[PDB]
């Protein structure tokens, strides 16, 4: 192929490489009879299976198609059937599945590139679907030609988000993409229960903390519910987050310092928390010294237990 | 996990000998009726004496191979463990049997 | 008995043995080794006779879908849709016996449709979803498996038509479960105002303002108000404003007939 591409046209380079890729009647039987055949059956018959053959065939097509193809052209109809044949042969790698969906979005075939993500995710195992769902959900919300309804974009998240956390992946971004887009198209703070689910799946502390900042902008009635639910090493970090929420909107915070120190070992960071709560006031270094006195006595009790 | 039932074990044993009979025909191919006597009622089948000999040889080879794969397991398991107190070999095989329980 | 007569290359004795053994209805291990026997012998017409009997001995989709995995392995298109036509009629013919579950019939409808999508006939892929949902309105899995077919092979207005229904059922089942989640109301109404406009569109707005006391609640009524107002309006406005208003009635009398309805709603 490579010597003929320089000497002769790419149409000559296709035609010598078209003869490689005849998918005859049945690839399932020929693939199996080749694998079970002990070196007697030639690989001339099962030559279509080879990924290397398809990728450099396609890369000639995707290079030869013009920058404006718009589906009238023969070649854009030719590279799409050659791309779809790879998916039907099922020998498509996930970087190659992105190269076809990217291929359609440059040539304004955006609404058919959502079919491209749709066909392939089923075929792949998770830990790889997470990289396709980023590129699929981002085209749905960011690309300008995609006019999808806000109940259709919400379908694409909560079909993925439910499916993808079911097999078990951290899913930090998809939660945020379903969190960020909710203001740009809908514009209400339903964001919290959409993002609470990140904190309570069945990193996670870094999803819980940024949003409990966000409802202190909107309204304190839905902050204080999170401050309760935030606390129910990692446990100690959750207690610290609760103390910060109390400072934003003090006795509940000090008692929380007790609840957190009693949550777990070391507790000096909690001392920094109560000290922060004391420092926040613009009252008497009496309750503070009493607090350090109570903490020290608790430490002495822990030493007695040990 | 868990164990395999006898109807699932018998099929896998039947699937395995079909692959031994497949490669036996492939190793052979690489190198190169019914009569019912009406008076007695007996049915006589005429078959190749080579395939009956290859049936009798392969059963003896599988019988010896499992005999040798178990004999080495007897010689290895006797010379693995000697920590816990024993008296004879039947005590060792019983105290090892208590270990597979827990 | 089999692997000895296999070893003697007596192919007519294992065939006579298997015909007897599959007559006593033993289980799926026997039949699957009997369809694997004829693949060895290349008897393609004989193994097709077995699956005719194998679906009658074990009526279940993993025996029917095994027979379509046989036919799609060989690529014979005339034989595969004949099996597909026999599989979906027998579910319809034997509906009252109740031996295939809702998740079980969804595997047959989807594997019929995704095969017809690969056979480039999208109008047969599309129409069978309608007959299956009507033929079975009970199973949600066949309705939900209808949607994923449109996502892959359908044109965009058809997906949005079907998407609007699944969102309708899922918003309906949360609000029946969860009592006062006011943020799902403000989308469920806007689900029906956007894509469902009809008698239902007015009706839910009644059914919402039924559910409407919080600060979190009452602004939903404000939405239903203008939703009514954009399109009576005074009559429902007085009924809701009755929550309590002596200053309001004195404010009402001075600027109801004097100035508008928008002035009337300003009091509320």
Curated annotation (Swiss-Prot), chain A:
Organism listed in the record: Saccharomyces cerevisiae (strain ATCC 204508 / S288c)
Quaternary structure (record): Belongs to the NTC complex (or PRP19-associated complex), composed of at least CEF1, CLF1, ISY1, NTC20, SNT309, SYF1, SYF2, and PRP19.
Protein name per Swiss-Prot or TrEMBL: Pre-mRNA-splicing factor SYF1
Role, per record: Involved in pre-mRNA splicing and cell cycle control. As a component of the NTC complex (or PRP19-associated complex), associates to the spliceosome to mediate conformational rearrangement or to stabilize the structure of the spliceosome after U4 snRNA dissociation, which leads to spliceosome maturation.
Positions annotated as HAT repeat: 29-63, 108-142, 148-184, 194-216, 218-247, 249-278
Superkingdom of source: Eukaryota
Species classification: Eukaryota, Fungi, Dikarya, Ascomycota, Saccharomycotina
Annotated compartments: Nucleus
From-to range in the entire protein, with total length: 492 to 819 of 859
Remarks, miscellaneous: Present with 2170 molecules/cell in log phase SD medium.
Homology family: Belongs to the crooked-neck family.
UniProtKB/Swiss-Prot annotation, chain B:
Subcellular location: Nucleus
Disulfide bonds: none
Signal peptide: none
Bias-annotated ranges (Polar residues): 20-32
Domain of life: Eukaryota
Quaternary context: Belongs to the NTC complex (or PRP19-associated complex), composed of at least CEF1, CLF1, ISY1, NTC20, SNT309, SYF1, SYF2, and PRP19.
Protein family membership: Belongs to the SYF2 family.
Function noted in UniProt: Involved in pre-mRNA splicing and cell cycle control. As a component of the NTC complex (or PRP19-associated complex), associates to the spliceosome to mediate conformational rearrangement or to stabilize the structure of the spliceosome after U4 snRNA dissociation, which leads to spliceosome maturation. The cell cycle arrest of SYF2 defective cells may be due to the inefficient splicing of TUB1.
Miscellaneous notes: Present with 1670 molecules/cell in log phase SD medium.
Protein known as: Pre-mRNA-splicing factor SYF2
Shown part of the complete sequence: 92 to 211 of 215
Swiss-Prot record, chain C:
Superkingdom field: Eukaryota
HAT repeat ranges per the UniProt record: 9-40, 42-73, 75-109, 113-145, 162-194, 199-230, 241-268
Signal peptide: none
Protein location: Nucleus
Record's subunit section: Belongs to the NTC complex (or PRP19-associated complex), composed of at least CEF1, CLF1, ISY1, NTC20, SNT309, SYF1, SYF2, and PRP19.
Entry similarity comment: Belongs to the crooked-neck family.
Additional facts recorded: Present with 2140 molecules/cell in log phase SD medium.
Function: Involved in pre-mRNA splicing and cell cycle progression. Required for the spliceosome assembly by promoting the functional integration of the U4/U6.U5 tri-snRNP particle into the U1-, U2-dependent pre-spliceosome. Also recruits PRP19 to the spliceosome, as a component of the NTC complex (or PRP19-associated complex). The association of the NTC complex to the spliceosome mediates conformational rearrangement or stabilizes the structure of the spliceosome after U4 snRNA dissociation, which leads to spliceosome maturation.
Protein name (Swiss-Prot/TrEMBL): Pre-mRNA-splicing factor CLF1
Gene: CLF1
Residues represented out of the complete protein: 139 to 413 of 687
